[PDB]
Ligand binder design. Sequence first.
Ligand SMILES: Nc1ncnc2c1ncn2[C@H]1C[C@H](O)[C@@H](COP(=O)(O)OP(=O)(O)OP(=O)(O)O)O1
Length: 320
Amino acid sequence: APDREKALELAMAQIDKNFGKGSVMRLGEEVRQPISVIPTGSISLDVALGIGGLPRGRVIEIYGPESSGKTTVALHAVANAQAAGGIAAFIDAEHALDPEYAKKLGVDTDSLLVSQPDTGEQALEIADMLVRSGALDIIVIDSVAALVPRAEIEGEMGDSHVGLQARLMSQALRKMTGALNNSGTTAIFINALRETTTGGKALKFYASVRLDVRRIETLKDGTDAVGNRTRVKVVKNKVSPPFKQAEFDILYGQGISREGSLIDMGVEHGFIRKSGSWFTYEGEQLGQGKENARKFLLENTDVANEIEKKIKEKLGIGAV
Ligand SMILES: Nc1ncnc2c1ncn2[C@H]1C[C@H](O)[C@@H](COP(=O)(O)OP(=O)(O)OP(=O)(O)O)O1
């Protein structure tokens, strides 16, 4: 009478119908639900996400050590959303944003809404009023940790002191997430690990996607400062199989290196060969050293585009 596989499908099906698609999924599964996304500005990461970008209408958490590249990703997403004629908001509670760097990543700063809330309640509230207006594509909340409650900001006593920031962060998410769905606005919460920073407790359960951004190498190329190599881990992903990993280089002054990506992604995926030290493509000499090679692809843009193309084919191409 029992047939495991059939029995398992009928179960999973009900799991998803009861809790939403993605509630349960085989890891090796290959998803064919092309959702609307905002390219992360990181091809590898886009593929690692399984849907080629951050899903629209969801809460995304990008936590990690300082300098690890979080903000760069967030901003890159913001640019990608604007390019697609999307409106982006930035709830700043750290006062660290460098608009000049943001322009380099490609963001249209002049059209970017910016707010600097008085208290955490205000911040989330403001961001919430924005979201449910339907005009936004993406909204960014800089520093989960800086969402300090009003009662703490205003001189309040050491009594009645409670994990209010968590509650604040919990209550706030409860109502915004639904609004985000209706509006289809991606919500990135930058969490800078120094509960995952008190309020990160709730976010963990509300986030549809969670990215563990981490600094792993100091791009040297040769013996000198250029940038840093980041490593993101999709620890949570309610819209594709989770736990995938991506890596990319972020050069100083510049954002995520496209060419860097390509050379990387081209290699593992065969198209480009590293005979050992030297890099080559379709028998074309590229250069000794990821950098000489990187440079190559920046100069000879005719290559690189056919490569990005070859890679965009073997992986994520037009669907349905
Ligand atoms: N103002 C800037 N000028 C040049 N390079 C920058 C600047 N800001 C960021 N970068 C580049 C080089 C850094 O190694 C890399 C990481 O910075 P950021 O992208 O700000 O890291 P982060 O997102 O992990 O830290 P955090 O989110 O806690 O502020 O980004």
